[PDB]
Amino acid sequence: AADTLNYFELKGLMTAYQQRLA
Amino acid sequence: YYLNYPQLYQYWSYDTYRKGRSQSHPAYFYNITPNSDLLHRLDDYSFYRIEGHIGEANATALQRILDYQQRYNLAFDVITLKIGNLQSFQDINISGQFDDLNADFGRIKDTFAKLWQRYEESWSRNVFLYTLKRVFFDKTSLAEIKSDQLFNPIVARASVKEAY
Amino acid sequence: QIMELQLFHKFAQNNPGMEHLGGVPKGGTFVLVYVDGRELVRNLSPQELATSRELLNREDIVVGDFCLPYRFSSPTVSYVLTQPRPI
Numbered sequence: 001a002a003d004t005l006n007y008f009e010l011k012g013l014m015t016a017y018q019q020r021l022a
Numbered sequence: 023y024y025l026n027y028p029q030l031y032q033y034w035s036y037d038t039y040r041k042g043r044s045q046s047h048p049a050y051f052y053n054i055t056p057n058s059d060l061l062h063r064l065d066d067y068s069f070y071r072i073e074g075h076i077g078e079a080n081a082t083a084l085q086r087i088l089d090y091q092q093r094y095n096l097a098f099d100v101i102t103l104k105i106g107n108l109q110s111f112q113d114i115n116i117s118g119q120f121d122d123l124n125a126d127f128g129r130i131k132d133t134f135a136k137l138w139q140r141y142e143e144s145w146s147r148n149v150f151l152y153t154l155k156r157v158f159f160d161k162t163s164l165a166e167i168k169s170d171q172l173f174n175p176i177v178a179r180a181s182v183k184e185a186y
Numbered sequence: 187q188i189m190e191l192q193l194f195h196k197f198a199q200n201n202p203g204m205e206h207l208g209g210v211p212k213g214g215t216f217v218l219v220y221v222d223g224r225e226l227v228r229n230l231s232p233q234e235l236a237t238s239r240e241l242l243n244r245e246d247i248v249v250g251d252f253c254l255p256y257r258f259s260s261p262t263v264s265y266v267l268t269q270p271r272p273i
Contacts, residue, residue, distance in 0.1 A: 004135075008131060009128045012124040099259060103197055103219055104220055105193070105195075112271075114269060116267075118266035
């Protein structure tokens with residue numbers, strides 16, 4: 001649960017990266 | 023197409039008159055109308071004349087022109103603009119998504135959540151903090167906040183001299 | 187800063203050269219120009235009459251054309267959404 005800030009940040013960033021690559 | 027074509031389709035060009043191909047000169051006449059000469063090779067033409075869009079609603083004109091481009095494989099771009107002043111955009115709601123800010127909205131959002139679980143006692147009694155928690159910082163994406171929710175309407179109305 | 191570039195007299199200062207030729211050159215750009223209904227019909231079931239008179243002066247009517255000799259478009263997924271407001 002200490003990694004949740006990284007969780008949301010990485011979710012958003014990886015989603016954007018995924019869309020551009022797709 | 024604003025010329026009286028049935029009377030001028032003869033008498034436009036002379037050598038076409040000599041050869042006798044005056045009925046086949048490119049023009050408008052003689053939901054949408056399918057042109058034919060767009061099927062054969064187009065080497066000695068450079069310009070597209072577009073006709074029939076004046077007086078219609080904006081979105082339907084865009085849709086029809088884009089589909090017409092797609093049906094015959096033509097090459098051009100399309101944009102639309104408005105005449106007026108900025109404060110006329112009161113008949114629509116404005117929102118938007120920018121990738122450049124996504125990684126921020128998460129970074130902030132979770133942060134607030136953490137602060138919720140450490141000052142919960144006093145914060146759950148302040149009405150301002152509860153409203154700010156349930157209007158913002160509780161939505162999945164920043165795209166769901168409209169432009170009107172970011173500023174006070176009364177000061178903005180006080181910004182125009184007409185309100186006095 | 188995005189909504190302010192939808193106006194004719196402010197778009198014209200970043201992309202000068204717009205002219206009316208009744209169409210578009212091969213590879214160019216076609217610019218439509220529209221206005222709100224309030225500025226055209228200045229002065230012309232009563233509730234249905236009122237709502238029709240109101241919504242038919244919020245419409246966007248296409249009034250004019252222009253052309254430009256270049257196309258400006260090239261995979262970002264940022265966008266802006268505009269939603270008609272109910273009456």
